[PDB]
Amino acid sequence: LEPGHAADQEQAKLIRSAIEHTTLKSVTIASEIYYDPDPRSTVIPEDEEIIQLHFSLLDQQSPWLLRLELDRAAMNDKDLTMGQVGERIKQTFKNDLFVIWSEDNDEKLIIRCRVVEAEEDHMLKKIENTMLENITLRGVENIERVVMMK
Amino acid sequence: DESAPITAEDSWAVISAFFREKGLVSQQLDSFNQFVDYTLQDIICEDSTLEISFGKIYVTKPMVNESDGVTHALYPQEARLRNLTYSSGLFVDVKKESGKVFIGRLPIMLR
Amino acid sequence: ETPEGQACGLVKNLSLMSCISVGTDPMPIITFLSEWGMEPLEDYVPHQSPDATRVFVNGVWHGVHRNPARLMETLRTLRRKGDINPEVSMIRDIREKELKIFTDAGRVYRPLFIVEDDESLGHKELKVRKGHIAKLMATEYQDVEEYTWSSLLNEGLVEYIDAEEEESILIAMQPEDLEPDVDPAKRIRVSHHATTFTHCEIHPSMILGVAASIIPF
Amino acid sequence: DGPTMREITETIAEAKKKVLDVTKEAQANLLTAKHGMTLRESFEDNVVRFLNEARDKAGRLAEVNLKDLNNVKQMVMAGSKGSFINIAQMSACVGQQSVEGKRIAFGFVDRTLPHFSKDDYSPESKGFVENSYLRGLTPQEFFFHAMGGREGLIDTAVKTAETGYIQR
Amino acid sequence: IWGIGCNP
Amino acid sequence: SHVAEIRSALEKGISTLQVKLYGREGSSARTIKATLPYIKQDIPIVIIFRALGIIPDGEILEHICYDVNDWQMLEMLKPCVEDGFVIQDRETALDFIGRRGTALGIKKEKRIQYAKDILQKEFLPHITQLEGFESRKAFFLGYMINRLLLCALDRKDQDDRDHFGKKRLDLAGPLLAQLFKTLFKKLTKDIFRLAINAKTITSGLKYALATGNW
Amino acid sequence: TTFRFCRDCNNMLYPREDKENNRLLFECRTCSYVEEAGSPLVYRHELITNIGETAGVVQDIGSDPTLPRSDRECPKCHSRENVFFQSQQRRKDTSMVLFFVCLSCSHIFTSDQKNKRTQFS
Ligand SMILES: [Zn+2]
Ligand SMILES: [Zn+2]
């Protein structure tokens, strides 16, 4: 660690999280696909609060919903917020995935996404997989685990 | 008593019983005895053919052929010293001398 | 006992009391199994009979059975009597819902003391008792009925166990572990005990092959 | 003289208690994992350190009791053969057997031998040898000590000649 | 034969 | 990612079978295909059931997944169902197999016939080699799939190849039976041409024992 | 999480959608059979899973000699006759928690004090 720190165990902790590679797979409890046709207006009671909101109207989009549920414990342990994870998914599919998420002071951690006839859930179970396996949230590409020592 | 739990000492009587019955090389004896008594016949029923059909097999006790000669029984000591094979002959009742036929010699495992 | 160089752990030696299955025709058993409630596999509707035990012989799934407990009782009794060949391995894996039988050659097994309650008495005891030992000691002494190793098998006293069946039993090391200060010079032992023992070792020194049987201590 | 014996026996009984207390802990689901280690991994780690430091301090207890006229201790002091470890296995405690760097594996389904119940991670079960060569091993400790035994033999047999080949 | 990170 | 293997032998009384999970976790459509002897493709397990006369998705999954409530295993199978979707009956299933063991000149009749023969005699022969025993093999192959899956779903350990319960030590007897069988197969071969050569047997039995050569 | 089959074919049903009413149907692809969905959940993948943790809890669990037995009071009938086992998942990532089975009553309980389950597996 940079000369002049090295004793600061918490700065070590930070550097650890910045280096250790973590994907969505590392932080996700479960993934589900729902038919949830009214944008708008969810079927999931628990998500009405998060749908509230927006709240916008700023100035589409299938009935199928991919919904991930993230573990707060593994989130903290990797210095990850909702906005960080959210913004990371978002700038992977940029304008062809609609993505929102429950907030950091929200009780459950929840990401919702829709592809912006058929097919199509799957194409979507693929997106699901492209998500868990291949998005990098924090850290460096080969670095699987990082232990601190003194 | 009778009856009457066993002490650890008593193990060895059980063990002597085991070895008195089986000795030290029973997996050799047993395996080969199985082969001769049942497996050998089994192989010969798993054929015929066509009609020629093989029936019952007999295995003779160990014999040497020849010189000579002059087929006579063979004891292990003699087989060992004289560089022979301790074998017995095989014979099969066949369907259309009298009335088996000699098909070869089987090396016999001792005891 | 194993050679020191290349052959290490590849050449092995059998321990003093192991033997090797020689093979027995499985058909009487398969036959018995159906008499005893083994529903054939052309009957098995799983969604409709889920708690059923899968019954396997020599690797064949012959069918399914709704109360294996009773079947296993009888199967055990039959082998302990000599009606099934003692050489035959029979394993019930309860949690796994599988009952597996082996009648083929080349399975390596060893004998152990059977343990039952008793009766009686009672707690659980070995089925060998001093009266059996006497008959052995007295058939030994002569050199009257022969009381031989075979008598012990036939009277359900001792039983052959292969590595597979060994998966489903609990074995006491000393017969003394089947009952209810410490001398400083003794080595420390750990029991628990136990109350659930099905078998007991004849003598632990029996895990050794021929060579090592010669080393003192 | 044990004295020393009483103390060594008690030293081990102590480590069986720290290992028991960590089992109860981890079975309640109270043990916390560290970072980048499983529960089970970090459980094993604690158990192996307790067991090792018990062995260690039991061997130390024996070496202090050896007196100047003690012949083994004289070889040692002179430097002519052998070591702490030697004295310690002989007089105190053989200690933990290990194949592939872990404690004895469940080669039977969830047990190391059929004399144990399933899911038993006690020292006895996984090959801590408690007894010294002096007191002699129990059959279980005997077998596990053979397991550890073989692992070393195999590795000796793999250099002869893996090394006569490097040197060339 | 001694302990983990010593001998087998 | 995983294989379930049987080397089915006969008493008597050879032919290995492999059930393969074409997968790797975090790969799309993990299908299961089986390797049958003589067929030059792995066959989607669903086509095999349909070859054995088990036709509806419902009954095939029944043979494999014995708990109705196990949606997890069930879901590992959808790609298998989609994998054999083009084949909707026993004749089609047989041709599909048949074509993969048969040169392009060969007539439909005989194609099918080839696949029936393979399934009767070459597939799971330790169960049977005869005539109308298709329910037994279907359930057995279902059983293997179950076992493949319970492993892929981290519910059982992969099998331990060093478990002694699953070894066999061959001895004087069985060793001599394999020679004797071969050596009786000459002479028995031969004679299709007094006038029995007794030396066929004596020599080979003695050769193998003199040199240690099996 | 639950599977439906054709009434006629006993083949798998696949999710279609009624567009202009916005509801979920399952159709057969072997005939023209259709039905409404009993639930919008089409699919679910559990990265961190409990299923199979208690596999093997069968009527005859107690006549199993290889299983450890204890004294913990059954939280239902208060009987002190149980067997217990650790978790039957075969993951590295598992806890070391104990599952008990009440031999008098069949009830499954845990030593897990951070317990967020109700029913098991
Ligand atoms: Zn339909
Ligand atoms: Zn209860």
Chain F residues with CB-CB distance to G3 below 8 A: 61, 71, 74
Bridge partners, A64 (sequence order): A35
CA distance G112 to G95: 9
Breaks, C-N > 2.5 A, in chain A lie after: 59, 116
- Beta strand C19-20 with B102-107: parallel, antiparallel or unpaired? unpaired
| Closest residue by Cα to residue B15 from C30, C202, D72, F192 | C202
Task: Specify whether C121 is located in the same domain as C54.
Answer: no
At residue B105's C-alpha, the angle toward residues B101 and B106, to 5°, is 120
| Closest residue by Cα to residue D54 from D17, D29, D27 | D17
Does residue F148 have a cis peptide bond before it, meaning omega lies within 30 degrees of 0? no
What residue numbers bound the domain in which C46 lies?
A: 23-104
Pairs from C33-39 (Cβ < 8 Å, separation ≥ 24): C33/C57, C33/C62, C33/C63, C33/C65, C33/C71, C34/C63, C36/C65, C36/C71, C36/C74, C37/C65, C37/C66, C37/C67, C37/C71, C38/C62, C38/C63, C38/C64, C38/C65, C38/C71, C39/C63, C39/C64, C39/C65, C39/C66
The secondary structure of chain D as a DSSP string is --SHHHHHHHHHHHHHHHHHHHHHHHHHT-----SSS-HHHHHHHHHHHHHHHHHHHHHHHHHHHS-TT-HHHHHHHHTSS--HHHHHHHHT--EE--BTTBSPP--BTTBSSTTSPSS--STTTTTEE-S-TTT---HHHHHHHHHHHHHHHHHHSSSSSTTTTT--
Q: How many other β-carbons are positioned within 10 Å of the β-carbon of residue C104?
A: 19
CB distance from C14 to chain G under 8 Å? no
Contacts of C52 (CB under 8 A, 6+ apart): C39, C44, C46, C64, C65, C66, C97
Residues in chain E: 8
Task: Specify whether C87 is located in the same domain as C126.
Answer: no
Q: How far is the CA of F144 from the centre of ligand 1 (A)?
A: 28
Half-sphere exposure at residue D133, Cβ-oriented, CA atoms within 13 angstroms: 10
Asked if D147 and D127 touch (Cβ cutoff 8 Å), the reply is yes
CA distance D61 to D71: 17
* Helix, strand, coil content of chain G in percent (nearest 5): 0, 30, 65
Nearest C-alpha in C relative to G60: C94
CA distance B82 to F90: 68
Chain D residues with CB-CB distance to C13 below 8 A: none
The answer to whether G44 is a known ligand-binding residue is no
CA distance C119 to F61: 48
CA distance F46 to F33: 8
- Beta strand F31-35 with F43-44: parallel, antiparallel or unpaired? antiparallel
Residues in chain B: 111
CA distance F148 to F33: 12
Burial G83-95 (b: 16+ CB within 10 A, else e): bbbbbbbeeeebb
Q: How many other β-carbons are positioned within 10 Å of the β-carbon of residue A53?
A: 11
B46 φ/ψ angles, rounded to the nearest 5 degrees: -70, 25
Burial D111-143 (b: 16+ CB within 10 A, else e): bbbbbbbbbbbebbbbbbbbbbbebebbbbbbb
Q: How many other β-carbons are positioned within 10 Å of the β-carbon of residue C137?
A: 16
CA distance D161 to D153: 13
Q: In which residue are the tokens 């009405």 written?
A: A48
| Structure token digits, residue G59 | 């009527």
Asked if G80 and G66 touch (Cβ cutoff 8 Å), the reply is no
Task: Specify whether C162 is located in the same domain as C119.
Answer: yes
A68 φ/ψ angles, rounded to the nearest 5 degrees: -105, 145
Task: Specify whether C100 is located in the same domain as C151.
Answer: no
Q: H-helix or E-strand containing C108?
A: strand C108-116
Asked if A33 and G43 touch (Cβ cutoff 8 Å), the reply is yes
Bridge partners, G69 (sequence order): G83
Ligand of minimum distance to the alpha carbon of G78: 2
Asked if A112 and A65 touch (Cβ cutoff 8 Å), the reply is yes
Asked if F50 and F84 touch (Cβ cutoff 8 Å), the reply is yes
Asked if C59 and F7 touch (Cβ cutoff 8 Å), the reply is no
Identify the three-state secondary structure at position G86. Answer: strand
- Please state which CATH number belongs to domain D1-138: 1.10.132.30
The secondary structure of C120-179 as a DSSP string is TT-S-EES--HHHHHHHHHHHHT------HHHHHHTTSEEEEETTGGGG--EESSGGGG-
Bridge partners, G109 (sequence order): G100
The answer to whether G9 is a known ligand-binding residue is yes
At residue A126's C-alpha, the angle toward residues A122 and A128, to 5°, is 105
Bridge partners, C56 (sequence order): C61, C100
D neighbour chains, 3+ CB pairs within 8 Å: A, C, E, F, G
CA distance F147 to F64: 9
Bridge partners, G28 (sequence order): G13
As a three-state string, the secondary structure of chain F is CEEEEEEECCCCCCEEEEEEEECCCCCCCCEEEEECCCCCCCEEHHHHHHHCCCCCHHHHHHHHCCCCCCHHHHHCCHHHHHHCCCCCCHHHHHHHHHHCCCCCCCCHHHHHHHHHHHHHHHCCCCCCCCCCCHHHHHHHHHHHHHHHHHHHCCCCCCCCCCCHHHCCCCCHHHHHHHHHHHHHHHHHCHHHCCCCCCHHHHHHHHHHHHHCCC
CA distance D72 to D132: 16
Q: How many other β-carbons are positioned within 10 Å of the β-carbon of residue A147?
A: 10
CATH topology of domain G1-45: N-terminal domain of TfIIb (2.20.25)
Q: In which residue are the tokens 């054995």 written?
A: F52
CA distance G64 to C68: 13
CA distance C124 to C116: 5
DSSP B39: I
Identify how the structure was determined.
Answer: X-ray
* Cα Rg of chain G (Å, integer): 21
Asked if D128 and D96 touch (Cβ cutoff 8 Å), the reply is yes
The secondary structure of A52-82 as a DSSP string is S----------SEEEEEEE-HHHHHTTT--H
Task: Specify whether C88 is located in the same domain as C113.
Answer: no
- Please state which CATH number belongs to domain A22-139: 3.30.1360.140
- Please state which CATH number belongs to domain G46-121: 2.20.25.10
Asked if C20 and B30 touch (Cβ cutoff 8 Å), the reply is yes
CA distance D140 to D97: 11
CB distance from G86 to chain D under 8 Å? yes
Which residue spans of chain G are classified as CATH 2.20.25.10? 1-45, 46-121
Contacts of B9 (CB under 8 A, 6+ apart): none
Asked if A114 and A120 touch (Cβ cutoff 8 Å), the reply is no
| Structure token digits, residue C96 | 């796994």
- Say how many CB pairs under 8 Å bridge A and D: 9
Task: Specify whether C57 is located in the same domain as C122.
Answer: no
| Structure token digits, residue C32 | 């018995």
Sheet-wide strand order for B87-95: B53-59, B87-95, B102-107
Q: How far is the CA of A35 from the centre of ligand 1 (A)?
A: 22
Task: Specify whether C92 is located in the same domain as C156.
Answer: no
The sign of the torsion formed by the CA atoms of F144, F146, F152, F155 equals negative
Residues in chain G: 121
Asked if C36 and C28 touch (Cβ cutoff 8 Å), the reply is no
| Closest residue by Cα to residue A132 from A33, A17, A28 | A28
The CATH number of whichever domain residue C94 belongs to comes to: 3.90.1070.20
Q: How many other β-carbons are positioned within 10 Å of the β-carbon of residue F46?
A: 26
